[PDB]
Amino acid sequence: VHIDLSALNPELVQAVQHVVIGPSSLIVHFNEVIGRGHFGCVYHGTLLDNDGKKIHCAVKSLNRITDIGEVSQFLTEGIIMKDFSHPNVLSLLGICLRSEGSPLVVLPYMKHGDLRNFIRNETHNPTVKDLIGFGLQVAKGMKYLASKKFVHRDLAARNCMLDEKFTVKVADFGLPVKWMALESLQTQKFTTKSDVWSFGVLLWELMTRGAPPYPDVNTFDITVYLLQGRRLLQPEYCPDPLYEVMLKCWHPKAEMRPSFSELVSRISAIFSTFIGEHYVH
Ligand X SMILES: COc1ccc2c(Oc3ccc(NC(=O)c4c(C)n(C[C@@H](C)O)n(-c5ccccc5)c4=O)cc3F)ccnc2c1
Residue 110 C-beta: closest distance to ligand X, Å: 4
- The distance of Cα 45 from the centroid of its chain, to the nearest Å, equals 21
Q: How many residues bind ligand X (CB under 6 A)?
A: 24
Q: Is 80 in the site for ligand X (CB under 6 A)?
A: yes
Q: Is 55 in the site for ligand X (CB under 6 A)?
A: no
Q: Candidates 26, 47, 90, 115: give the one binding ligand X (CB under 6 A).
A: 90
With H, G, I as helix, E, B as strand and everything else as coil, classify residue 127: coil
- How is the beta sheet containing 54-61 ordered, strand by strand? 26-34, 41-48, 54-61, 104-108, 94-96
49 is catalytic: no
Residue 35 assigned to a binding site? yes
- The distance of Cα 88 from the centroid of its chain, to the nearest Å, equals 10
- Determine the angle formed by the axes of helices 192-207 and 128-147, rounding to 10 degrees: 170
Written as one letter, the residue type at 6 is S
Q: How far is CA 174 from CA 64, 68, 81, 152, 195, in A?
A: 17, 20, 10, 5, 11
CA distance 155 to 146: 13
Q: Is 176 in the site for ligand X (CB under 6 A)?
A: no
Written as one letter, the residue type at 23 is P
Q: Candidates 28, 128, 168, 171: give the one binding ligand X (CB under 6 A).
A: 171
Residue 231 assigned to a binding site? no
Can you give the length of the chain in residues?
Answer: 281
Which one is catalytic: 4, 51, 83, 154? Answer: 154
Q: Is 81 in the site for ligand X (CB under 6 A)?
A: yes
Contact positions with ligand X (CB under 6 A) in 4-23: none
Residue 173 C-beta: closest distance to ligand X, Å: 5
Residue whose CB is less far from ligand X, 250 or 260: 260
Q: How far is CA 44 from CA 28, 108, 109, in A?
A: 6, 10, 8
Residue whose CB is less far from ligand X, 68 or 80: 80
Q: Candidates 28, 34, 136, 139: give the one binding ligand X (CB under 6 A).
A: 34
Instruction: Select from 47-55, 108-116, 184-192, 270-278 the region that touches ligand X (CB under 6 A).
Output: 108-116
- The distance of Cα 151 from the centroid of its chain, to the nearest Å, equals 11
Residues belonging to the binding site for ATP are 34-42, 60
Residue ranges binding ligand X (CB under 6 A)? 34-35, 39, 42, 58, 60, 74, 77-78, 80-81, 90, 92, 95, 105, 107, 109-110, 113, 161, 171-174
What residues are labeled active site?
154
Binding residues: 34-42, 60
